[PDB]
Design a binder for this molecule. Structure first.
Ligand code: A1B26
Ligand code: ZN
Length: 140
């Protein structure tokens, strides 16, 4: 579990969104596994606006933050789960790192701020849904 709190927005994995998220929806995209809802309080996270390929992510199944090198956001074939069958996930970046079921949400950050959140993985991989192209998170 986990979310990004920027301005009056809450960014979560679409598959973990609650009823309150759907009842206060701003934007959602199933191909990216992202959903954004509105919040009453202002958040403290800052979004990175950059093309970094090195950063640090939080792994809840190890209670640890790990430094990683990650790929540029791309369209990659991901296999099935209980929440999704097998499909092209867009705007996804991959790194070598431990992940297991439950870690979806954890933040990936670079020197500029938040880059994205944990979405997929396995086999010593961990994927992350990028949010650096969502410029509107910085305003209104
Ligand atoms: C870090 S998640 C993970 C890590 C190691 C192994 C398996 C997972 C589960 C997983 O990938 N899930 C469950 C919802 C999203 C994603 C998914 C993508 N497309 C279908 N399933
Ligand atoms: Zn950066």
């Amino acid at each position: 579990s986990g979310a990004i709190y920027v301005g009056n927005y809450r960014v979560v994995n679409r598959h973990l969104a609650t009823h309150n998220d759907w009842a206060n929806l701003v934007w959602e995209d199933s191909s990216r596994d992202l959903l954004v809802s509105s919040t009453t309080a202002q958040g403290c996270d800052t979004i990175a606006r950059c093309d970094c390929q090195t950063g640090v992510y939080y792994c809840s199944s190890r209670r640890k933050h790990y430094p990683v090198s990650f790929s540029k956001p791309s369209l990659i074939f991901v296999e099935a789960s209980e929440y999704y069958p097998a499909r092209y996930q867009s705007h996804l970046m991959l790194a070598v790192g431990h992940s297991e079921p439950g870690d979806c949400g954890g933040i990936l950050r670079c020197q500029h701020g938040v880059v994205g959140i944990v979405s997929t993985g396995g086999n010593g991989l961990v994927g992350f849904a990028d949010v650096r192209d969502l410029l509107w998170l910085d305003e209104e």
